[PDB]
Symmetry: C4
Subunit: 308 residues, 4 copies
């Protein structure tokens, strides 16, 4: 019972390219990889510079006079020379001097490595408006849930506390139930496949409406609430995880929050209203108590729905 | 009766991460936050530079000779040193000198802070073609509205003054009406939920047509215009806010302009035509008077529609 | 009869913010506006620098000694000073010297103008994969069109020469016909509104199929081909512009190429097949002759379709 | 029988703008074009600089004294001068000197070419999250396929090994079959056009469900399996290429992998189960053997399905 590590189907007896999605950012993290790539490139350039300054035409410390390039003080000085050149700072006193064939070749390759390294930086991630870490999920869904008589014939709706700038709302159910069934000669397909959205059936979801607050209508003979309901199904339950689908301009990215809301926590309602008016007009400012809605401390342990 | 502060459902007795959507631009605004972040970073670097120049190996004003770094004149000079270095200007006379261990460490971290700060700039917002502040809403909808006999059986259409480059037009109704109804044992669901698009029913909206100018057909028994219409419903009205949905490649961003057009301002039509031809061909240049269309100073206070 | 300048509805007696869509590129154009904005900003900075160098604390040519800033040679030298500083080049010999209060203020504002101008550059347009100038419209539609008997009951299809990487194909008809009709008391609505896709009705378009090559089925009583067809409707025609809709992940951007294909150029078919095999397998390389398909030099001037 | 070079329709007797899609990257390729454009621009600037230094006001090697610009050592030195200036490095000792009219003009045009060339770099491709080279196609479809009795009335499903982060799954069939049929007076339309998804008909595909594993229901009279099946259709087959459509937020980009799975490789099933449990719960880690599922070494060469 998880989300990342489910879909269990395969064993026998058990029971450079980095890129991919792993190139991202974690707020105060994941820039360390970029900075270390930077410093390794810089040190590579610096060590090449020191070795060649040991073996350059003007040699170390300009033994020939009129140096082909201002030789570095030491190996660390060559590191600093590399960083100076590539970072587009360019003092000149310690940098290249009058052109020299080998010096010309190296400096043009250094210009090349500089421009493509700047390209490496421009390959910075854009974890931005398109790919944020704080999801627009300001919709408080519910808490310990409710059943009630549902107007006798499965009529109610779910709480929604959407504040996504009061706009950008359009959803559907999609979803899928789960239970290990049986099938002839197959692997029994441990899946309901029925996808019945029975319950608070009030018809806003499949209807082309801005904010689907209700769920599509699923008539009886799919739910065990023919006769006797509430506690008989509240006690007997495994997973009634409720997941909505298809809000953000597409059904794919959407949001797949678990929200188990199992029948154990759908006990008898018990959320009358803490509002002092219950119908007119309240805040003009903000929400206060989130979910409390739809009590039913009236239907006892036994509650017939359709058979009566 | 608002748009930003509606959906009133919850009280009990009342009655660093910035990011989010608040990282945006307001034309001649919201760049001040970026510039102040810049200057605070720059001053932090400068004050660190001044303190370390007070405590560097070459100390203040190069008391050791052959300075590890050209020491700044003062604290403000250290501020300018920081800005000089990070902004990739790099004079050199006041900047770093022959490499020094602590100087090497600080300057490499300064290169790091420079490259990631450039990343901070590249994290500039792109409030552009994708996210503009001037919405493509050149469609003049209407003004004080009209009723007429609607060809007896709810047949008319609404004015549209679309000039969105004469293209990029495809819409639908969606929408939803509102009124505080009652329901058994529930919160009465103060919502119509019917979503009847009754009125100028002429059938272009739901039909797969480029520019839906009309509205879908809603036959009688949903509108109080069985017998007696026009003024009886014009006087008795609360909110007939007309909102279209789903134009810009999706039903979600769309446009949700109010356009109340309540039955009080649907008085008797009174827009014959100011055109001199009324049927042939007019401008080749631009619109002039927007909305004036569809008079009806003929149907009196009493106007039967279907019952007759 | 146009595309940019149609929708003629309004006259009476006639008969800084730039942004918008006008911020774009035209291949070898529209970068001139960016470069001129650049140079005007640069000249503004340079002229301010020259005037202040005339009125600075160290005055022109450092009349005070130990100049607050290396004064420019002249007004053009101040222009070059500005360009040097902002473009993040930073020599130093001609640039700022030991810090000075007014010099400190000006140089920090210059750092500000530099960073926000770099922001102006980063506000470069991205006329790229998302917004290209070369549309993926490699589909050769047709030429002088064909009618034939259409299997008696409007059965044929249109040519398609799609080579959009052999993928990314999913379309529909949508569309709309046009003719000046009449209507009671209205403006007669000079529009067909019928949107009948009569003709090569073979049923792939509305069916959820990858590449809709045919058109949806429109039975007779909508086309004048009850009895007598081909030339009687070929001669009498105004505009039969054929436009497909909804290919590129949405019905809105799509493609609205005219492709008039009027009944005058639907004369008798006359495209048998220039293929040497006509059924098996041809190129493995590329297309050759585009459109030639579906002759019918057999149906004479008179051609009954349904009445017979 | 291909994908890139199909759609054979046209011969007669056969039988600067680069941009387009060809501006992309191939991992360790396609940056060479960018670097060569860079170096050609740099060499153009350098050769112009050398020629003008030969013909400048201060002439070669500053024959006038107080040079308008520090003249380069040679033609290669002019190349390096160009690269130095444009790459925003800016030493100064070899670079421009006190302003000179012609020198002013050239250096301002050089600033222009520098800023627009930086624009050329910023026109770097973004072959990234939106346009990756490694497709999210971790779904193992199947191998040598199976038929079985299909519960008598075409009831089974296809294997899916999706691991696309266990989410982002929503598909449909679309597709199209192919066979050279005949038609009256037309080109015979070598295409089935039926698009019958007959086979493992179990109804999840067209149903609005998260992961469509099955295919839509196509009853008999469309498949030759009235009486006698399995081997009679397994031996007689040309192309039964199975392609799914519409997963990645749209039906257009989707995935069009061939997966021929022709009836020759649908021989008798022969994949019982290598699982040791076959129904409960296996890995919590990863897949092992991919496809092996749905044996049927029981139906002989002759196998009636519906007629019996």
């Amino acid at each position: 019972r998880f989300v990342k590590k489910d879909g269990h189907c395969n064993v026998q007896f058990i029971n450079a390219d980095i890129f991919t999605t792993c190139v991202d950012i974690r707020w105060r993290w994941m820039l360390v990889i970029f900075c270390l790539a930077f410093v390794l490139s810089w040190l590579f350039f610096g060590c090449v510079f020191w070795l060649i300054a040991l073996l350059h035409g003007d040699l170390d410390a300009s033994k020939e006079g009129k140096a082909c390039v201002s030789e570095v003080n030491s190996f660390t000085a060559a590191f600093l020379f590399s960083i100076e050149t590539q970072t587009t700072i360019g003092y000149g006193f310690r940098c290249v001097t009058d052109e020299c064939p080998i010096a010309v070749f190296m400096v043009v390759f250094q210009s090349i490595v500089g421009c493509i390294i700047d390209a490496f930086i421009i390959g910075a991630v854009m974890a931005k408006m398109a790919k944020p870490k704080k999801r627009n999920e300001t919709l408080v869904f519910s808490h310990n849930a409710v059943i009630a008589m549902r107007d006798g014939k499965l009529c109610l709706m779910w709480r929604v506390g959407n504040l996504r700038k009061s706009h950008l709302v359009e959803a559907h159910v999609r979803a899928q139930l789960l239970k290990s069934r049986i099938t002839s000669e197959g692997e029994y397909i441990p899946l309901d496949q029925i996808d019945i959205n029975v319950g608070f059936d009030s018809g806003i979801d499949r209807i082309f409406l801005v904010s689907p607050i209700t769920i599509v209508h699923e008539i009886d003979e799919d739910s065990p609430l023919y006769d006797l309901s509430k506690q008989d199904i509240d006690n007997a339950d495994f997973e009634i995880v409720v997941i909505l689908e298809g809000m953000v301009e597409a059904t794919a990215m959407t949001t797949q929050c678990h929200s188990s809301y199992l029948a154990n926590e759908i006990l008898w309602g018990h959320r009358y209203e803490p509002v002092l008016f219950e119908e007119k007009h309240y805040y003009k400012v903000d929400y206060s108590r989130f979910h409390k809605t739809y009590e039913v401390p009236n239907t006892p342990l036994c509650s017939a729905r359709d058979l009566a």
